[PDB]
Design a binder for this molecule. Structure first.
Ligand SMILES: *[C@@H]1O[C@H](CO)[C@@H](O[C@@H]2O[C@H](CO)[C@@H](O[C@@H]3O[C@H](CO[C@H]4O[C@H](CO[C@H]5O[C@H](CO)[C@@H](O)[C@H](O)[C@@H]5O[C@H]5O[C@H](CO)[C@@H](O)[C@H](O)[C@@H]5O)[C@@H](O)[C@H](O[C@H]5O[C@H](CO)[C@@H](O)[C@H](O)[C@@H]5O)[C@@H]4O)[C@@H](O)[C@H](O[C@H]4O[C@H](CO)[C@@H](O)[C@H](O)[C@@H]4O[C@H]4O[C@H](CO)[C@@H](O)[C@H](O)[C@@H]4O[C@H]4O[C@H](CO)[C@@H](O)[C@H](O)[C@@H]4O)[C@@H]3O)[C@H](O)[C@H]2NC(C)=O)[C@H](O)[C@H]1NC(C)=O
Ligand SMILES: *[C@@H]1O[C@H](CO)[C@@H](O[C@@H]2O[C@H](CO)[C@@H](O[C@@H]3O[C@H](CO[C@H]4O[C@H](CO[C@H]5O[C@H](CO)[C@@H](O)[C@H](O)[C@@H]5O[C@H]5O[C@H](CO)[C@@H](O)[C@H](O)[C@@H]5O)[C@@H](O)[C@H](O)[C@@H]4O)[C@@H](O)[C@H](O)[C@@H]3O)[C@H](O)[C@H]2NC(C)=O)[C@H](O)[C@H]1NC(C)=O
Ligand SMILES: *[C@@H]1O[C@H](CO)[C@@H](O)[C@H](O)[C@H]1NC(C)=O
Ligand SMILES: O=C(O)/C=C/c1ccc(O)cc1
Ligand SMILES: [Ca+2]
Length: 503
C-alpha cells in the first residue's frame, strides 16, 4: 500500500499518494472543493486509499480515487456524480469498499458544484458527459489488477441522478465496462431535463408575480393532491401515491371564490400548477419532457422556488448558448430546441438500443423514487417504453437484462415518507440481503442468474436511520402496479401484490 504509491504506473496518471486506513476511521477531505460534500466519511473496513490525477487532454483532467479493501471479494465497483459536480461521492465509495468491492470514484472532470469550468472548454464537458466515469473504470480495473495480483471477477456501477444518467451512458455507449449497473433516478434525456427544470421559473415567474406560488402555496397544492389522488386511487391514505400515472390533479378544486384571497389559488396560479404537473412541448409541437408528477414533493423546491435554477441556467449559459449573459427569465422553446441540437457528446443519454449490453450478458437495475420532484419519475417509464419500442422487446423479454423499479414514497436518491430504504446508498440503506438491498440484488442477478422480481424498501420506526421496521414494501418492476389487498395492514408487505393484468 505504502509502496504502491511508487510501483503503480498508469497511462496519463500521477499517483499523489497512497494511504493505509483501518476499519472505523473518520477519513477527512481537506482538499475537497468548499462546495463539495461530505467533508469526511467513515470506512467500516480496512482500505488502501489511492488518490490520482488523470490528464484527459491539453486542458481537461480528473481526480480519481480507488479505495481498495484488505478483504477483497474480487469485485470492482465504479461510483458516479451528482448535479453539475464536480465531487467524488465518498459515502458511495465507502459503501462499496464496506462490501469488499475495490471501489473507484472520480470528480467528473472539474472541482465543485458549478459548471463554470465547462465554459469554452469542451474537454471538461466531455469528462462530465462520459469520459470521467469511463476512464475511471478502465484505470480502476488496471490498478485493481496491479494491487491484488489478479483481475477483478465482475464489474459493477452504482449511481443516482447525474450518476444514474452516467450508469445509462455506460449501458448505452460503453456496454463492456460493467457486467451489472444500478442506475437511480437518472438525469437521462439530459437536455430535456435541463429544459424542463429551467422552464419552471418561466412558468411561475418571480416571487410576487401573479403566476408564482410561495412554498406554503405549493404545500397546500400537495395536500390537495393527496385529497384527489391518494386513498381514491390506491385505497391507502399514507400520503404516498402508489402509482401516480392514475393521478390527473384538478387545481380548480382550490380556486379563490368572490373575495376569498387566502388558502386558495387564483386563475394565474391554477395555470401554473397545470403547467408544472403538465408536459413540456416546444417549437413545431415537439415533445421536450414529461410533467413533474403530483405528489412528488422531495427536492421540488430546488428548480421550483424563489430564484432561477442553477443547473439549467449554467447549462444554457456555459454549454448550449456559450453566453454568460443568457437570461433564465426569458427561457423558452428556442432554448429547448437549441439544447437538443447541440447535445454535447450525446449527453441526452436517450439511446433505446441496448443490443450490446443485452448480448454480452450484462444486467441493469433501473429505479426511480415516485416522490422525486427534482427528476420526474415519469421520464424513467418513458425511457423503459422507448427501449421496448426501439428493440422490439416486450416487458418479459426486457425482464431478462433490464428491470425498472418504481419505488413509492421515495424521494431524490433518498428520503421520502414511504418504505424508501432500498440500499442504493448509505443515506437510503435498509437491510443487507439481495431482496432488500439493490446492490446485492445486482450481484445476485449477475453472479447467480436470479433477477429481482421486486426490490424491498423499509421505513424504520419514526423515520429513523435504523431500528424496528415500521413499513416494508416490495416495490414493483414496471409495468406492474402495487395493489393493496383491501384487508391486510398496509404497513405489512404481505398486504400488497405487484399486478400486471394480461386478460
Ligand atoms: C457552444 O459551443 C459548443 C461547443 O463548441 C457548440 O456545440 C456543438 O454544437 C453542434 C451543433 O451546433 C453539435 O453538433 C450536433 O451534435 C448533435 C449531437 O451529436 C451527438 O449525439 C447524436 C445522438 O443524438 C441524437 O440521436 C439520439 C438517438 O440516437 C437521440 O436520443 C438524441 O436526442 C439526438 O437526436 C436529435 O437530433 C438528431 C440528429 O443527430 C435527430 O435525427 C433526432 O431525431 C433527434 O432530434 C449522435 O448521433 C452523434 O454521433 C454522430 O457524430 C459523432 C461525432 O460528433 C460521431 O462520432 C458518431 O459516429 C455519429 O456520426 C453525437 O454523439 C447531433 O445531433 C447534430 O447532428 C445534426 O447536425 C449535423 C450537421 O451539423 C448533421 O450532419 C446531422 O445529420 C444532424 O442533422 C439533423 O439535425 C439537424 C439539427 O440538429 C438538422 O439541421 C439537420 O437537418 C438534420 O435533420 C434532419 O435529418 C435527421 C436524420 O438525419 C432527422 O432525424 C431530422 O428530423 C431532420 O429531418 C450535430 O452534429 C456538436 O456536437 C457540439 N459540439 C460539442 C463539443 O458540444 C455549440 O453549437 C455552441 N453554441 C452555439 C454556437 O450557440
Ligand atoms: C480538485 O480537488 C482535488 C482534491 O479533491 C485536488 O487534488 C489534490 O490535488 C493536490 C495537487 O494540487 C494534491 O496535492 C499534492 O499532494 C502530494 C502528496 O501530498 C502529501 O505529502 C506531502 C509531502 O509530505 C512529506 O513532506 C512534508 C514537507 O514537504 C512533511 O511535512 C511530511 O511529513 C512528509 O514527509 C515525508 O516525506 C518526506 C519527503 O517528501 C521525507 O523527507 C519524510 O521523512 C517523510 O517520509 C504533504 O505536503 C501533504 O500533506 C500530503 O501528505 C504532494 O507531493 C504535492 O506537493 C501536492 O501537495 C492532493 O494530493 C490532491 N488530493 C487528492 C485526494 O487527490 C485537485 O488538485 C483539484 N483539481 C484542480 C484541477 O483544481
Ligand atoms: C486541468 O484542467 C483545468 C481546466 O482546464 C486546468 O485549469 C488545469 O490547468 C489542468 N491541470 C493540469 C495540471 O494540466
Ligand atoms: O444529480 C442530481 O441530484 C440532479 C441532477 C440534475 C441535473 C440537471 C437538472 O436540470 C436537474 C437535475
Ligand atoms: Ca397511498
Amino acid at each position: 500500500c505504502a509502496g504502491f504509491k511508487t510501483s503503480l504506473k498508469l497511462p496519463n496518471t500521477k499517483v499523489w499518494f497512497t494511504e493505509h486506513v483501518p476499519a472505523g476511521k473518520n477519513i477527512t477531505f481537506p482538499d475537497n472543493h468548499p462546495t463539495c460534500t461530505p467533508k469526511s466519511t467513515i470506512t467500516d473496513v480496512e482500505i488502501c486509499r489511492v488518490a490520482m490525477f488523470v490528464t484527459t487532454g491539453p486542458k481537461s483532467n480528473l481526480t480519481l480515487e480507488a479505495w481498495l479493501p484488505s478483504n477483497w471479494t474480487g469485485r470492482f465497483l465504479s461510483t458516479g456524480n451528482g448535479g453539475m459536480a464536480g465531487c467524488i461521492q465518498y459515502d458511495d465509495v465507502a459503501y462499496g469498499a464496506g462490501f469488499g468491492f475495490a471501489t473507484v470514484g472520480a470528480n467528473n472532470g472539474h472541482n465543485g458544484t458549478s459548471a463554470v469550468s465547462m465554459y469554452k472548454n469542451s474537454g471538461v464537458v466531455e469528462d462530465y458527459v462520459y469520459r470521467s466515469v469511463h476512464t475511471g473504470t478502465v484505470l480502476g480495473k488496471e490498478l485493481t489488477k496491479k494491487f491484488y495480483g489478479k483481475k477483478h471477477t465482475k464489474s459493477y456501477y452504482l449511481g443516482c441522478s447525474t450518476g444514474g444518467r452516467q450508469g445509462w451512458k455506460e449501458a448505452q455507449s460503453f456496454p463492456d465496462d460493467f457486467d451489472g449497473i444500478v442506475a437511480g433516478a437518472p438525469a437521462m434525456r439530459f437536455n430535456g431535463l435541463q429544459s424542463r427544470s429551467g422552464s419552471f421559473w418561466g412558468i411561475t415567474g418571480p416571487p410576487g408575480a401573479p403566476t408564482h406560488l410561495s412554498p406554503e402555496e405549493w404545500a397546500m397544492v400537495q395536500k390537495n393532491v393527496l385529497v384527489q389522488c391518494d386513498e381514491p386511487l390506491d385505497g391507502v391514505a399514507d400520503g404516498i401515491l402508489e402509482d401516480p400515472n392514475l393521478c390527473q390533479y384538478r387545481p380548480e378544486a382550490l380556486v379563490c371564490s368572490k373575495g376569498q384571497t387566502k388558502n386558495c389559488l387564483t386563475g394565474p396560479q391554477i395555470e401554473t400548477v397545470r403547467k408544472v404537473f403538465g408536459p413540456l412541448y416546444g417549437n413545431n409541437g415537439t415533445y421536450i419532457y414529461p410533467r413533474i408528477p403530483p405528489g412528488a414533493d422531495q427536492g421540488f423546491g430546488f428548480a421550483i422556488g424563489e430564484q432561477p435554477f442553477p443547473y439549467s441556467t449554467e447549462w444554457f449559459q456555459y454549454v448550449i448558448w456559450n453566453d454568460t449573459k443568457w437570461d433564465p427569465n426569458t427561457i423558452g422553446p428556442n432554448d429547448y430546441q437549441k439544447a437538443s441540437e447541440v447535445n454535447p457528446f450525446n449527453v441526452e443519454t436517450w439511446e433505446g438500443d441496448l443490443s450490446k449490453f443485452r448480448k454480452r450478458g450484462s444486467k441493469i437495475i433501473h429505479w426511480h423514487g415516485l416522490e422525486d420532484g427534482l427528476i420526474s419519475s415519469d421520464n424513467s417509464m418513458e425511457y423503459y417504453n422507448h427501449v421496448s419500442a426501439t428493440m422490439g422487446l416486450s416487458n418479459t423479454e426486457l425482464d431478462e437484462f433490464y428491470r425498472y423499479f418504481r419505488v413509492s414514497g421515495c424521494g431524490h436518491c433518498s428520503g421520502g415518507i414511504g418504505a424508501n430504504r432500498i440500499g442504493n446508498n448509505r443515506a437510503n440503506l435498509g437491510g443487507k440481503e439481495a431482496k432488500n438491498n439493490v446492490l446485492l440484488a445486482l450481484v445476485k442477478w449477475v453472479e447467480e442468474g436470479q433477477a429481482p422480481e421486486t426490490i424491498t424498501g423499509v421505513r424504520y420506526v419514526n423515520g429513523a436511520t435504523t431500528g424496528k421496521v415500521e413499513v416494508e414494501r416490495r416495490h414493483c418492476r414496471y409495468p406492474y402496479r402495487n395493489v393493496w389487498d383491501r384487508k391486510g395492514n398496509y404497513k405489512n408487505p404481505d398486504s400488497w401484490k405487484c399486478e400486471l393484468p394480461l386478460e
